[PDB]
Design a protein around this ligand. Structure first.
Ligand SMILES: Nc1ncnc2c1ncn2[C@@H]1O[C@H](COP(=O)(O)CP(=O)(O)O)[C@@H](O)[C@H]1O
Ligand SMILES: Nc1ncnc2c1ncn2[C@@H]1O[C@H](COP(=O)(O)CP(=O)(O)O)[C@@H](O)[C@H]1O
Ligand SMILES: [K+]
Ligand SMILES: [K+]
Ligand SMILES: [Mg+2]
Ligand SMILES: [Mg+2]
Ligand SMILES: [Mg+2]
Ligand SMILES: [Mg+2]
Ligand SMILES: [Mg+2]
Ligand SMILES: [Mg+2]
Lengths: 355, 339
């Protein structure tokens, strides 16, 4: 429902033009990252998870905060704004923190975009960011906006919590299960949407999926990426979640491993199946080692929460989230006595997910 | 550079594009873009000030990012950090509860350069933070066409810790705690003036940009400051006009003299309208505080900040009755601040 025409722009405008897409995404890779950052009674959390937790000098309060930024991934500016904001907030929600006391916005304007575009397109993005922040029960009260070759979209989310408002991501025990609350394959969906404007590329998977399927995985990806994990965070309290992370840029497996290493208990995770936006596995599979959606290594953007739940609270949680109005969740695996690592079995079961 | 198995021709500042007018979206555009969006401070100053439910406390925070501006990776990380904290300091907040770091690793730089250079930048950032009694406990690191350098500063404040920047009155004076001209030093050192004139100026500016505004923040309390901002990407007039518009009273700011890095005024004059330094709209990086001070206190503040680690500050203008605007006088005196 975005038409460049409907705004006095060239029919040819793509918001996705102001960055370069990569099957494996834009984040400095996990292992490279962990090396570059080597010098850097109340539970604290420093570098390594989704949020810091910084005990404050005042009254048993802790500072809980997070930052993130991405580049344009859909051509709908308003929705892209929602997504940039939802991605920022995703990480509070990984800590079960339902409230956001304040947001900041990180904005890059493309030095390649005309004034007309900027004054037309940027406001949609800002409205989108503001509206998601409003659903989140918070607001943007400062930020930074500079010229960059690419459109940069991010922000900061900070909460000053009492001890029970957050859940430390380390209480998993053998016999917990793994609940994922959004389907995988967002990167395939957005990229493959960009490929249809490009013959050479569209010729390749032309033989795998219809333009209709692609439009459909796109609207769906866009929908779920704009979806706040706020509800999922709240339900983690009710159903006694032991640990959670969210699935963003390092892919289902990278973040699963990252959660696994934080566990106090000697446990490991095994992922047995993967919910995936329909047709996207076949697409990833059709493009060799470009995405790797099958191996857990493909980037997600603003994915869902991966949650360690008591075996007996798992189904109640799924029930509740799906039928409050809500969106179905999936139990994808198990936690075991293990060495603090994560794996997807060799031949995982693909749960094809339809709109 | 050759010291780290890197090209004799490796330049950190190669990984951005220099514009005499800097990279920030103009003040005037940003307002149009953004017009869709216990004391309380929202958009429009140096920090936000968000009253919380707990203990009469307020969440005071700020975020910023820049690109390479000096060719010393370590000092650039130092400057990157000093720059984010500067906004806590404008508010008179000497303490930082937490920092996050923003990093963009240029796709144009080799894995080898990335692997040598980034740990250096990060190291300067870490040291700057520690100097400010804080540390970095999170961030985001992403590929970009340029090297991107920022972060966030956060403090959870009792009311006593900050000074609302809106309390100026006629007769107050304006003091500036770091000299001007950084964009010019930085612009020409990548390239009337000698190379020794330009090298020493670049060396001064680099140290000035890495200096914290923390001792000034503290001294704002000691000497009962009435308002403050810090002089950064919009330059001297730009930030003075944004501070003036913030005033509760009917006051305007008049700036009479400009303390500029030695010879940088001379470089600005020659480059036509490339910098526009004496006009007030030349971008600074991690500049000093501009403080509205009772006339009686201003002298002591300046003497005190000169020697408590000691650094010179200037009384550059006056607070007068008016309609909440700022201007540079028609023929401003340029104070030449030598190394
Ligand atoms: N994308 C954005 N969203 C919300 N607020 C913003 C954004 N960009 C800038 N701001 C706010 O607008 C004002 C002007 O920005 P800057 O000039 O960068 C403030 P400073 O010079 O103190 O760093 C500040 O209040 C800043 O926090
Ligand atoms: N430049 C940086 N400085 C300090 N910490 C960083 C930096 N970049 C990333 N981090 C931290 O390193 C960890 C991994 O990074 P990310 O995967 O981006 C965290 P998430 O996936 O939850 O967004 C996080 O705890 C993050 O806060
Ligand atoms: K994060
Ligand atoms: K700021
Ligand atoms: Mg996360
Ligand atoms: Mg991140
Ligand atoms: Mg994240
Ligand atoms: Mg400022
Ligand atoms: Mg700024
Ligand atoms: Mg600033």
């Amino acid at each position: 429902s975005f038409n460049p025409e409907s705004y006095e722009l060239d029919k040819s405008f793509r918001l996705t033009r102001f960055t370069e897409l990569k099957g494996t995404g834009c984040k400095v890779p996990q292992d490279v990252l962990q090396k570059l950052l080597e010098s850097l009674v109340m539970p604290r959390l420093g570098i390594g998870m989704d949020t810091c937790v910084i005990p404050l000098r005042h009254g048993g309060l802790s500072l809980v905060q997070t930052t993130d930024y991405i580049y344009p991934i859909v051509d709908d500016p308003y929705m892209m704004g929602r997504i940039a904001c939802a991605n920022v907030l995703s990480d509070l929600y990984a800590m079960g923190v339902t409230e956001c006391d304040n947001m900041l916005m990180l904005l890059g304007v493309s030095n390649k975009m005309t004034d007309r575009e900027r004054d037309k397109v940027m406001p949609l993005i800002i409205q989108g960011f503001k509206d998601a922040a409003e659903e989140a029960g918070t607001s943007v009260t400062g930020g930074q906006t500079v010229l960059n070759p690419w459109i940069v979209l991010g922000g900061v989310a900070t909460t000053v919590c009492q001890p029970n408002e957050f859940i430390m991501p380390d209480n998993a025990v053998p016999g917990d299960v793994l609940v994922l609350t959004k389907p995988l394959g967002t990167q395939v969906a957005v990229a493959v949407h960009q490929w249809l404007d490009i013959p050479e590329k569209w010729n390749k998977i032309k033989l795998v999926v219809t333009q209709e399927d692609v439009e459909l995985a796109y609207q769906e990806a866009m929908m779920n990426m704009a979806r706040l994990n706020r509800t999922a965070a709240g339900l983690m309290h009710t159903f006694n979640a032991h640990a959670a992370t969210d699935i963003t840029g390092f892919g289902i497996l990278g973040h699963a491993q990252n959660l696994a290493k934080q566990q106090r208990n000697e446990v490991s995770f095994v992922i047995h199946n993967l919910p995936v936006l329909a047709k996207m596995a076949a697409v990833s599979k059709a493009c060799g080692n470009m995405f790797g959606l099958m191996h857990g290594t493909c980037p997600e953007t603003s994915g869902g929460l991966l949650i360690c739940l008591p075996r007996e609270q798992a189904a109640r949680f799924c029930a509740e989230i799906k039928s409050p109005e809500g969106h179905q969740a999936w139990i994808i695996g198990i936690v075991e006595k293990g060495n603090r690592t994560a794996r997807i079995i060799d031949k995982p079961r693909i749960i094809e997910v339809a709109p």
